[PDB]
Design a binder for these strands. Structure first.
Lengths: 78, 232, 236
DNA sequence: ACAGGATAAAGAGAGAAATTGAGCCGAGCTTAAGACCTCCTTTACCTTTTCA
């Protein structure tokens, strides 16, 4: 259970580096808050802009995380 | 969670219209046909917003608002009053009711939703300006009347500059927002992509008019106001 | 304290009506006739409420509101928008500006006062503008009367340092420490060079400087005319 | 124990969808050198003050 609390923190940290909108998008697209993965369309309605906009945000966030900077600890969690 | 809205109105047709429009907007709607049930439901549910009619039977809407303000559990709940607006006396009594906002019936659904959004932002992007319109879905810019295809990074850079239109953005801020890199990483990449933007957007890239270089500070996107487009 | 209200409107008649009515209601009213001066006053004063017309010159009311929302010092200041209300597009763009409320012109004075009361019930440090100068930090520019002057970074910081001490003599050592962070004993002659550039940009006659005065043996003083005298200096 | 009968809940048969990864390309991106334009510093020589 202690490698669970620890992990989330590390993830949250790298999430902080991302733009506010970006991180919110990610948290909602993976259910980090509610455990429930949400579609495009729920964020299309809940968020300001509609569908096909959240997909762009998701890719532009992941591309930021995929860099060797701002996310390399989690590589060992795999 | 979804924000909870309590709508209190004796017009079932208005009540239904409002409820439908709020649910379509993603809210949890509760409906009440009278001030007594409305007050009890407000106390029971602690809704995130109350929309309150004026002409409820047995108890006027003002007394309802005053009672919500007198109960510590409801004293802080925002109250958007729906009013038939016709007498300076109802105005004067609303001036004492503790209403947070007023909305005149008949109202536009968009105005109602704007007020709801502002109240919720209180409890808790530029895609077009002048001659520039961003098309995210195609990574394209409308530049005056010509369509310009952008690369992903060129588009994101232009968007980052548009978000801070008329202000100088530092290279470190561009690196952080577009690339997510450490502030100390090589800024030379930015210098390249700004040049492409100028090649695509300025009439003369050697004398750039809109994408200016502020030596020692960064880059600034200065766009003419819509009133000046005819001169450019 | 008395609540501070900043009214930003290019219509002098609306601006005066509003100011008079708020003062009758007991508020401390500040007035700005354009979006740049309005923004500078908002940053400098941190007013308790902003009333923001829509159609301000050089900077639209939407851009002003967005910039106020972008500054951590002003992001929480309530914004009551004054709008000529006529097209759904201005509606749609205001729907993203972060305005707190809208009031359609013409408005009843009582409605205005009600909105002011509701916003105030809900809510509960540098001089960037004086007389003929707005300083524009984000662009390293000065509005001097009605002309834009591009400044270098050190020239801008020097002019700001002098503006912070408007009407007082600033010692060269204080300038070295504040702008350059240097020791009081470093060569002040460098400052003397950059001061003339400001005069070259700002004075009508650099040989007979009126505004950037030298206080012999003491330093430099920026003496600016009060706003009431501006009409006598623009022709210069 | 064993045989018959009724039934529902859990496997096989197929294609069509949806992904999927794979090669084969040139479009996007980075690297490094050189030139090249602002900003600044500091000098040499002054003019211009306040004062004995």
């Amino acid at each position: 259970e202690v490698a669970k609390n620890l992990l989330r923190e590390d993830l949250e940290g790298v999430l902080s580096t991302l733009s506010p909108r970006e991180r919110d998008v990610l948290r909602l697209r993976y259910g980090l808050d509610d455990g429930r993965m949400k579609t495009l369309e729920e964020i299309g309605q809940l968020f300001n802009v509609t569908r096909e906009r959240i997909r762009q945000i998701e890719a532009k966030a992941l591309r930021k995380l995929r860099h060797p900077n701002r996310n390399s600890i989690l590589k060992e969690y795999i | 969670m979804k924000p909870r809205i309590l709508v209190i109105d004796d017009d079932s047709a208005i009540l239904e219209l409002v409820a439908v429009n709020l649910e379509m907007s993603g809210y949890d709607v509760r409906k009440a046909e009278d001030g007594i049930k409305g007050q009890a439901l407000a106390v029971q549910l602690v809704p995130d917003l109350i929309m309150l009619d004026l002409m409820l039977p047995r108890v006027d809407g003002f007394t309802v608002c005053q009672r919500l303000r007198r109960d510590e559990r409801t004293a802080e709940i925002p109250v958007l009053m729906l009013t038939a607006l016709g007498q300076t006396q109802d105005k004067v009594e609303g001036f004492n009711a503790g209403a947070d906002d007023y909305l005149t019936k008949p109202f536009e659904v968009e105005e109602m939703l704007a007020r709801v959004r502002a109240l919720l932002q209180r409890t808790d992007e530029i895609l077009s300006y002048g001659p520039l319109t961003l098309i995210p879905e195609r990574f394209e810019a409308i530049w005056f009347n010509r369509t310009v295809k952008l690369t992903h990074l060129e588009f994101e850079l232009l968007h980052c500059l548009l978000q801070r239109h008329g202000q100088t953005v530092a290279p470190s801020e561009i690196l952080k927002e577009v690339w997510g890199y450490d502030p100390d990483d090589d800024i030379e990449t930015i210098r390249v992509h700004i040049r492409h933007l100028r090649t695509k957007l300025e009439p003369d890239p050697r004398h750039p008019r809109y994408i200016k270089t502020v030596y020692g500070a960064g880059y600034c996107l200065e766009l003419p106001a819509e009133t000046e487009l005819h001169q450019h």
